[PDB]
Design a protein around this ligand. Structure first.
Ligand SMILES: CCCOP(=O)(O)OC[C@H]1O[C@@H](n2cnc3c(N)ncnc32)[C@H](O)[C@@H]1O
Ligand SMILES: [Mg+2]
Length: 594
């Protein structure tokens, strides 16, 4: 009888031998022996291991005094204390100083055959003069800055310009409604917001400026709204508040000094929905987050400086934060900013992009892979000679989809890396290491460096030791890129993550660890449901539906559904519009019951 039934008779797949033959460089680890050696040091002497890793990967303005203080139960963890650094220096300046004409960003626009490439020197200029705009409009170190931007390179300019002056960027997914944008801007107390006149995605127009205008009536602390002219459409304009990106940046110099930030100064807020109530502003600080981003970029995704890294995620979510922006730029390679969808103009789009730009690592969600698999294999007829790493994030990749990814997309030539992590962990925590770790379809494999996973009994909270076990997934030790608080609400941070099982970090996920020690993520044990790549609160959908006058009691379960007690076919459609106003289109239920 097998406790972890999903692993019954599943063999490990070695890295394809052709991966090493075709590799342009020498990979970072010699094999699984070195992983085990480094992993054991990361658990048994994290002070030594992470000091060396941080000093390898991150340039500090002032070296740090101590690797880590605090404990999980104390909720007081600090990493690289005494250090000083700047995230934009590490993502931009240090690379522009060595190789100014190296391409940092490839922008792939909604329409094929547009876009452009941006060098590290060009990125330094744009980050600098955008930072000048913010400084000139009164943004100071420690202020938050709301960002409501689509996938254009200007989004990277905005994150890194905020980091350059020590402002705390608070990115809001550009598909959120006015109410959601308002809620996040109010909670973050931002006085400055950055957006576009409109977005273009999949040939469709998104009225970003209109949505922002609606949200800002209820954000009177916002006194500046910088608008990037993406489409040039006539948009309403608020004199004295609104500013044109292109008019303002050209007033200011092409260089700006970077603020000397503490290791533990906040870098950003990322609002995420939890099991109960209002969105949590998950706060990441500076040094530990960047160290985790660079370490996983390097050792999980096998990133080398010449690589062309393509994450299909959106900057509005943590995957885009860590792997579109911070990790590849920290490591000095090229990152791809993709404005379109995998289906526009046709289902070949992902592969057209990878082929044209010779992408070396591609990172997407299984939801997109399932869509494309249903579309048919004739859409894929691309050499994609340099594609050696195929990443998957957000949900377990099913053996049927894993095989299609490995064979049809990767030509049995690429290593498939199923990365498990969350907004709160900053970077990958359970994952194979690209080009190193043997994999199992449907399994996230083994812990990353510094991650000490344990399986707990959900009721008694006790550790369940050894292999072939199942239960709650928790981590036993702090790690550098862990979220440090929930903005304005440290007690909620403690209660949610650290007080449930004292001494451990609670992921909210169930998991099994099979006879080989490989982990298999079972999904959320709480009321978080994943629909089409989004982390949505069933209570948030419940609260939205209830706000309608004819709805009394509302229940939402997970494709989310909604059984409500109140024409009955007319009301079924009217509740959807109420969700569209409270959250956004991507949170409307798939069926509405009465
Ligand atoms: C990392 C981007 C998604 O970040 P979020 O904070 O939005 O969601 C994290 C949650 O997604 C699932 N999850 C994430 N990665 C995996 C994964 N690879 N396998 C299974 N479930 C996964 C797990 O339930 C987890 O608690
Ligand atoms: Mg007002």
């Amino acid at each position: 009888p097998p406790v972890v039934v999903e692993a019954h008779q599943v063999d490990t797949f070695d890295v394809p031998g052709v991966f090493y033959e075709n590799h342009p460089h020498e990979p970072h680890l010699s094999g699984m022996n070195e992983y085990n050696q480094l992993y054991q040091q990361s658990i048994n002497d994290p002070d030594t291991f992470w000091a060396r890793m941080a000093r390898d990967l991150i340039t500090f303005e002032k070296d740090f005094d101590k690797t880590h203080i605090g404990t999980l139960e104390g909720g007081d963890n600090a990493w690289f204390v005494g250090g000083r650094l700047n995230a934009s220096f590490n993502c931009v300046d240090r690379h522009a100083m060595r190789d100014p004409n190296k391409v940092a960003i490839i922008y792939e626009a909604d329409e094929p055959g547009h876009g452009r490439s941006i060098t590290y020197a060009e990125l330094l200029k744009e980050v600098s003069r955008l930072a000048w705009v913010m400084k000139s409009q009164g943004v100071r170190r420690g202020d938050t800055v709301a960002i409501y931007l689509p996938m254009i390179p200007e989004a990277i300019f905005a994150l890194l310009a905020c980091a350059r002056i020590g402002a705390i960027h608070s990115v809001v997914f550009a598909g959120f409604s006015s109410d959601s944008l308002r809620d996040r801007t109010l909670d973050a107390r931002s006085k400055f917001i950055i957006t576009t006149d409109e977005g273009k995605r999949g040939g469709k127009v998104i009225g970003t400026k209109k949505i922002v205008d609606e949200a800002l009536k209820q954000c009177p602390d916002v006194t500046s709204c910088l608008v990037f002219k993406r489409t040039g459409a006539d948009v309403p304009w608020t004199k004295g508040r609104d500013l044109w990106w292109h008019e303002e940046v050209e007033k200011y110099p092409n260089y700006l000094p970077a603020e000397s930030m503490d290791s533990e100064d906040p870098l950003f807020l990322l609002y995420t929905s939890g099991s109960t109530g209002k969105p949590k502003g998950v706060m990441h600080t500076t040094a530990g987050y960047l160290v985790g981003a660079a370490a996983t970029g390097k050792y999980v995704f096998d990133i080398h400086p010449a690589d062309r890294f393509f994450c299909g995620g959106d900057v509005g979510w943590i995957t885009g934060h860590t792997y579109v922006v911070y990790a590849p730029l920290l490591l000095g390679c090229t990152t791809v900013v993709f404005e379109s969808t995998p289906a526009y103009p046709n289902f070949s789009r992902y592969w057209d992009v990878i082929e044209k730009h010779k992408v070396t690592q591609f990172y997407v969600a299984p939801t997109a892979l399932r869509l494309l698999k249903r579309a048919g294999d004739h859409h894929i007829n691309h050499e994609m000679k340099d594609l050696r790493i195929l990443g998957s994030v957000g949900e377990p990749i099913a053996a049927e989809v894993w095989k299609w990814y490995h064979e049809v997309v990767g030509k049995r030539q690429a290593h498939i890396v199923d990365t498990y992590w969350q907004t709160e962990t900053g970077s990958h925590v359970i994952t194979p290491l690209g080009g190193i770790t043997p994999t199992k379809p449907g399994s996230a494999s083994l812990p990353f460096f510094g991650i000490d996973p344990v399986i707990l009994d959900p009721v008694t909270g006790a550790e369940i030791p050894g292999n072939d076990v199942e239960g709650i997934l928790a981590f036993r030790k702090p790690w550098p890129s862990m979220a440090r608080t929930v903005w304005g609400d440290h007690k909620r941070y403690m209660d949610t993550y650290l007080n449930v099982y004292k001494g451990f970090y609670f992921t909210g996920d169930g998991a099994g660890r099979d006879h080989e020690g490989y982990y298999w993520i079972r999904g959320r044990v709480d009321d978080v449901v994943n629909v089409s790549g989004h982390r949505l609160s069933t209570a948030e959908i419940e609260a939205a539906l209830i706000e309608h006058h004819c709805v009394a009691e509302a229940a939402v379960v997970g494709a989310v559904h909604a059984f409500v007690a109140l024409n009955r076919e007319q009301l079924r459609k009217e509740l959807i519009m109420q969700v569209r106003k409270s959250i956004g289109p991507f949170a409307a239920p798939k069926v509405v019951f009465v």
